Amino acid sequence: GEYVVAKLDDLINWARRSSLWPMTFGLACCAVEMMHMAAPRYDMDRFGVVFRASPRQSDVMIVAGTLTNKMAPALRKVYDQMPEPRYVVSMGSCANGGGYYHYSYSVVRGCDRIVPVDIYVPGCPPTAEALLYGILQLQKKIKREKRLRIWYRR
Amino acid sequence: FAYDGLKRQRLTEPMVRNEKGLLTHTTWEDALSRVAGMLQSFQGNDVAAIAGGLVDAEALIALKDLLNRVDSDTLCTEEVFPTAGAGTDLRSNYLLNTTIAGVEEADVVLLVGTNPRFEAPLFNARIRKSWLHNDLKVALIGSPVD
Amino acid sequence: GVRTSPTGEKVTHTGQVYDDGDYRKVRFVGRQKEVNENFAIDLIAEQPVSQVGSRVISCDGGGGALGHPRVYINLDKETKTGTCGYCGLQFRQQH
Amino acid sequence: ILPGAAYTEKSATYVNTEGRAQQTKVAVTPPGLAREDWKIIRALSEIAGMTLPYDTLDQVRNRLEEVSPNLVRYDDVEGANYFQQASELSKLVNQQLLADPLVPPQLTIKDFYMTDSISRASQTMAKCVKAVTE
Amino acid sequence: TSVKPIFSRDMNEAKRRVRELYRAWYREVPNTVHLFQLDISVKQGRDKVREMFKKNAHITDPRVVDLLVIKGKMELEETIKVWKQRTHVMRFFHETEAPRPKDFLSKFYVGHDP
Amino acid sequence: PTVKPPTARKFIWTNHKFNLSGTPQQYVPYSTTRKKIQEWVPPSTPYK
Amino acid sequence: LHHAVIPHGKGGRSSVSGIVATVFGATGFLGRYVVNHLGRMGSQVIVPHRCEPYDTMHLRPMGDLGQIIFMDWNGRDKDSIRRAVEHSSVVINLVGREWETQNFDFEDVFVKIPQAIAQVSKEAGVEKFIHISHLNADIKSSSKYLRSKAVGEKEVRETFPEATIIKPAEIFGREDRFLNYFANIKTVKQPVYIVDVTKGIINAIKDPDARGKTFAFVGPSRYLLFDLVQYVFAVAHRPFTTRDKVERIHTTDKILPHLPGLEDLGVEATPLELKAIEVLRRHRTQPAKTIP
Amino acid sequence: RPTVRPRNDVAHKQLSAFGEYVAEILPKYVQQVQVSCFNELEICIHPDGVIPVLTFLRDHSNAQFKSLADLTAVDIPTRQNRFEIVYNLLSLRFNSRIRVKTYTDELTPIESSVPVYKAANWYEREIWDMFGVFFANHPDLRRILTDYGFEGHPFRKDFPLSGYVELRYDDEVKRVVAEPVELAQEFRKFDLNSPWEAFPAYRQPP
Numbered sequence A: 001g002e003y004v005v006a007k008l009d010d011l012i013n014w015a016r017r018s019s020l021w022p023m024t025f026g027l028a029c030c031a032v033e034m035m036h037m038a039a040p041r042y043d044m045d046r047f048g049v050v051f052r053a054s055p056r057q058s059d060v061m062i063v064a065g066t067l068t069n070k071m072a073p074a075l076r077k078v079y080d081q082m083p084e085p086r087y088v089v090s091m092g093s094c095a096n097g098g099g100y101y102h103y104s105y106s107v108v109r110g111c112d113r114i115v116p117v118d119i120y121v122p123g124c125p126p127t128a129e130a131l132l133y134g135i136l137q138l139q140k141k142i143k144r145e146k147r148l149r150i151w152y153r154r
Numbered sequence B: 001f002a003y004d005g006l007k008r009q010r011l012t013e014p015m016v017r018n019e020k021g022l023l024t025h026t027t028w029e030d031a032l033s034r035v036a037g038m039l040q041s042f043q044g045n046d047v048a049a050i051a052g053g054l055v056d057a058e059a060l061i062a063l064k065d066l067l068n069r070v071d072s073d074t075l076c077t078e079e080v081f082p083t084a085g086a087g088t089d090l091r092s093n094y095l096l097n098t099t100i101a102g103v104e105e106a107d108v109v110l111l112v113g114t115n116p117r118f119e120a121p122l123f124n125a126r127i128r129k130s131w132l133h134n135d136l137k138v139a140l141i142g143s144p145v146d
Numbered sequence C: 001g002v003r004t005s006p007t008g009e010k011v012t013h014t015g016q017v018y019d020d021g022d023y024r025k026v027r028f029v030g031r032q033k034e035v036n037e038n039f040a041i042d043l044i045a046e047q048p049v050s051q052v053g054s055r056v057i058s059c060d061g062g063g064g065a066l067g068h069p070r071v072y073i074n075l076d077k078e079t080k081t082g083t084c085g086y087c088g089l090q091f092r093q094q095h
Numbered sequence D: 001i002l003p004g005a006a007y008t009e010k011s012a013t014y015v016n017t018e019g020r021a022q023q024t025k026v027a028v029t030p031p032g033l034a035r036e037d038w039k040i041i042r043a044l045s046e047i048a049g050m051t052l053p054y055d056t057l058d059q060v061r062n063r064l065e066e067v068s069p070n071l072v073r074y075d076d077v078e079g080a081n082y083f084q085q086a087s088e089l090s091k092l093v094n095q096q097l098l099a100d101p102l103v104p105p106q107l108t109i110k111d112f113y114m115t116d117s118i119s120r121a122s123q124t125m126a127k128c129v130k131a132v133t134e
Numbered sequence E: 001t002s003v004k005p006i007f008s009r010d011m012n013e014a015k016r017r018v019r020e021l022y023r024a025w026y027r028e029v030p031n032t033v034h035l036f037q038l039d040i041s042v043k044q045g046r047d048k049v050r051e052m053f054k055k056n057a058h059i060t061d062p063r064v065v066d067l068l069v070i071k072g073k074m075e076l077e078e079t080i081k082v083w084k085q086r087t088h089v090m091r092f093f094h095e096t097e098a099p100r101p102k103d104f105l106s107k108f109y110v111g112h113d114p
Numbered sequence F: 001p002t003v004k005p006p007t008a009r010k011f012i013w014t015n016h017k018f019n020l021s022g023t024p025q026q027y028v029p030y031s032t033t034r035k036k037i038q039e040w041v042p043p044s045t046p047y048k
Numbered sequence G: 001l002h003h004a005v006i007p008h009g010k011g012g013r014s015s016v017s018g019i020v021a022t023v024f025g026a027t028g029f030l031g032r033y034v035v036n037h038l039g040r041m042g043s044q045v046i047v048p049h050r051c052e053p054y055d056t057m058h059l060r061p062m063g064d065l066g067q068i069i070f071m072d073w074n075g076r077d078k079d080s081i082r083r084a085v086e087h088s089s090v091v092i093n094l095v096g097r098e099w100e101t102q103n104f105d106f107e108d109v110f111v112k113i114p115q116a117i118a119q120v121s122k123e124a125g126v127e128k129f130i131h132i133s134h135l136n137a138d139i140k141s142s143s144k145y146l147r148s149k150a151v152g153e154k155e156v157r158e159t160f161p162e163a164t165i166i167k168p169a170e171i172f173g174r175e176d177r178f179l180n181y182f183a184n185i186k187t188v189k190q191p192v193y194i195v196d197v198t199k200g201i202i203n204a205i206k207d208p209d210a211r212g213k214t215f216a217f218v219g220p221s222r223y224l225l226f227d228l229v230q231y232v233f234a235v236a237h238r239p240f241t242t243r244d245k246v247e248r249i250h251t252t253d254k255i256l257p258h259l260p261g262l263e264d265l266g267v268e269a270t271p272l273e274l275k276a277i278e279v280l281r282r283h284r285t286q287p288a289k290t291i292p
Numbered sequence H: 001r002p003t004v005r006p007r008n009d010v011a012h013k014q015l016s017a018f019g020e021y022v023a024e025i026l027p028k029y030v031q032q033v034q035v036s037c038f039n040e041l042e043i044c045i046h047p048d049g050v051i052p053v054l055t056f057l058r059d060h061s062n063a064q065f066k067s068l069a070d071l072t073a074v075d076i077p078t079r080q081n082r083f084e085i086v087y088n089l090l091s092l093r094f095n096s097r098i099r100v101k102t103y104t105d106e107l108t109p110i111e112s113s114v115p116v117y118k119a120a121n122w123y124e125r126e127i128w129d130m131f132g133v134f135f136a137n138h139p140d141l142r143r144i145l146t147d148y149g150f151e152g153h154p155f156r157k158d159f160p161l162s163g164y165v166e167l168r169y170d171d172e173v174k175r176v177v178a179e180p181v182e183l184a185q186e187f188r189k190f191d192l193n194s195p196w197e198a199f200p201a202y203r204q205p206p
Ligand SMILES: NC(=O)C1=CN([C@@H]2O[C@H](COP(=O)(O)OP(=O)(O)OC[C@H]3O[C@@H](n4cnc5c(N)ncnc54)[C@H](OP(=O)(O)O)[C@@H]3O)[C@@H](O)[C@H]2O)C=CC1
Pocket: G024, G025, G026, G027, G028, G029, G030, G031, G049, G050, G051, G074, G075, G093, G094, G095, G096, G097, G098, G104, G109, G132, G133, G134, G135, G167, G168, G169, G170, G171, G172, G177, G178
């Protein structure tokens, strides 16, 4: 029986990591490098990562740029409308911890004050390749998930 | 250079004696309750205070006001000063009335029972300045210190 | 020169280690304490003293422009060696 | 034991040998649970039902002014007079001089470095004492 | 002591603007509680509005009063037009800020701040 | 590196490691300085 | 106090409360509020969890960097309990299930697991222990849920005598299985607000007089179950589950005058009428009569 | 001299001459005229002269400063009138730039220049938001950059760099909340100024 549960986890994990549909908050500079990840050289679509997805068909939110206090409530609302399972990738110093505006009166010091974060991509900005490395790292995180194995043991 | 002593042997928490007679950390609430209880049960000469060398004036008057409210006037310092005659009635009895800068105006200085070099190094330096530039005449009654 | 404490936690080259009652070592439970094992203080001590035939030698740390600012070391005292203030290499005037 | 603050950790009034009142400023706060000294006594007075009539630094310094007005004249040297009156009283009672010679407590540099709790706790002052005695 | 006025030329005219602003705020609270789906009562909303006015009761400069009303009108415009979100409206109530101690002893126990 | 090998140093890692985030070998930050203020330790024996 | 746990700051996110807490059952209803209030004031929180890390994600924003630490644990593995508690100054047990599973019955969640946490905490030297029981815990209850709560409540008091035991009534709140339970459809009830229970728990950690005591957390008003369910439907704008669950809902809320309550920890009980709409607004597509 | 920026005396004279020209024509408002060593002309005016002086520079046939390049403020707390209002204008006809400066304090309105330049609309909103200077007769004066309900004017020298409040999501109330700002690492103030004078040419008489 546990053999069945192990293989269904593999199946659903494979499907979810193989069809990661992102919503990008293109907040600032870092949005440019995610555009270069979609561009032909890296072609995120070839991994199953569609270029643009609506928030309600999205699986991963990519916070790409500085999150201000004025924008923080809007970002939380979009996260709360994401169907589950949902993941958050924080990309760039600004989103990671405030970066170069960390000491500003108007900047949230890291988007993890507003939403939970699964992957932190460092850089100002991270290169398109560095972002792609972070996306592939999120895929490996999903591969490790054991939702049914843990469900069967409750 | 003595500032590094501010990082050693510091008192960081209130302490009280426990059942075994050893000092043990406690809260501010608990420690002050123990003191307040003993303070409320004594009056007059049963309560005294001694002020150390580095105490500030705000704490000196607060402690004086507190013991005065149990009718205690035994507010003492470690350093003696004769209470004979005027005592501390007149400030001029216990002050450097000439002022430190006044040394540069003097022509004779009589030092009595003191070693200013170590007691007041910057005061002694002000004497040497006068000695060097004003041809000040200095005499000492006491030990022949350098 | 890495050593462990009575708790088994490794002491860093800066002498850091959480003591017995420090809760903060809970951060290492299920993970690890990053420690660099190549203590620079011990590595420099392994270098031999260079014997030179002059009162003053210069050191730039090697590699020319890839080293450190060039400094001149006085070797008049025979009690000890001349040590470069930048890289720690030692020099001694011969006889 | 009530942990107080050192002179680098409070804004507090000191009067030098001239009678000149000066104040410190807080450079760092007291360590751990230590508190400003006049606040400890003020807090103690309230728990003992004898609340003192001042709640801030400015108010305790208003109190200091009621007792000795010169204590809040910062950097000023207030002259003191009436040496004649003091001299008259000093003669009223005759006390004999002891035969002991006048010997200062500090005779050499070794006695200079440690004279209070702060300097007695200083490792630098210990090195100085060792250096001049050896 | 001659200065350029903002709107009011004296405190009597300034006070008329204050009362108009208070009336506008008082009447808007029931709508705000409904549109923003607030969990406060209308009484709480109006009590908060009254509190905000009261803390500025001691002003005697008509220019300062004028600026306070100008800012009050802008705050009301942001609320009426739903430029604010629910978070902005609820920031007047400090719902997650545990009360700071006020008496001397409580402040003495916790830290060094006056 | 088969044609121009890197310069050898004794301290250079002989075994490369890949990204270890999410494993028991992940880096955990901590302060590398020692305690600054030393508290006074009361005497062990009783004497009030 | 060890120097690391002396309080500092102004009680905010970046402050240091001096509390180092292990919260078992932190991924549930009560746990999310407890962890939030601990992280609000800058406490170190250790979160042992049995579930997927994905299911602990909502806890991460609750503390500043490094203040929330997650660990795996198994209720039946005492070594995993020892790892989680050996650095803590307080242990909080919120473990429980409203139903039984093939792997865990009520005697496991409410007796065996709490006793093991209490015993290992005692051995590890933990000073404070806070254990959540139930107001209606009773070995003669018709509910196997409430009978186990009584047995375990006794074993904790014996194993860790200094434990603070808290006995809440039915707790209502956004994620409750009480008001939501009625909205998803003889007896007097005295339900208590989730934030009140959380504040009571937090103040028990600080209060030294709370050690060794047993508290009953109840709301300010008593209601007939019929009058309460009627009010829920009115608030939800709606025209007006296991066997053990039904027994609990029909058990009258005990009145234990001798026990200290929320007012003995400085907490004012929140009336249901103030907070009911908060919980029931999402259910939308006359205050209830109270017993004097 | 390869490293020294060359001077331009022809432009310096032209701008100086136009500076006198402007001051002769608008003596009611012009308080000072100066030309910098890198050839920028600044007219300093009484705040009453904003509309007349700007209108003259836009419309006069020897001016034709049709473009408002920028409008901003500078906070100088030591001055009685701490706010300096700066208008940078461009004349395409004469390929020239000019700067007009006036002043105000916290409580004194400045006349809005939207009637002269429609570009002024948002700039004056930004000055209101960042500095708290009120512009009279503005078609729509309100904050433009700061968050809704934000208190204070961040660009004032006495406003702290990190402000007074910071935001986070709170799970208990299920929304973003504002709280007094605490920093895990305080911003480290640096004292960088050398104690030796750099530029004798600007020494202030003692
Ligand atoms: N809510 C109420 O109305 C009242 C509750 N209580 C008590 O308060 C405590 C918490 O209440 P609540 O938070 O509502 O309960 P929840 O069911 O909401 O959360 C229960 C917690 O227990 C954990 N848990 C359950 N079974 C196991 C297990 N076998 N091994 C390990 N962990 C386990 C769950 O973790 P996972 O997510 O991994 O399942 C979850 O974190 C419980 O003890 C409950 O009985 C008392 C009175 C009233």
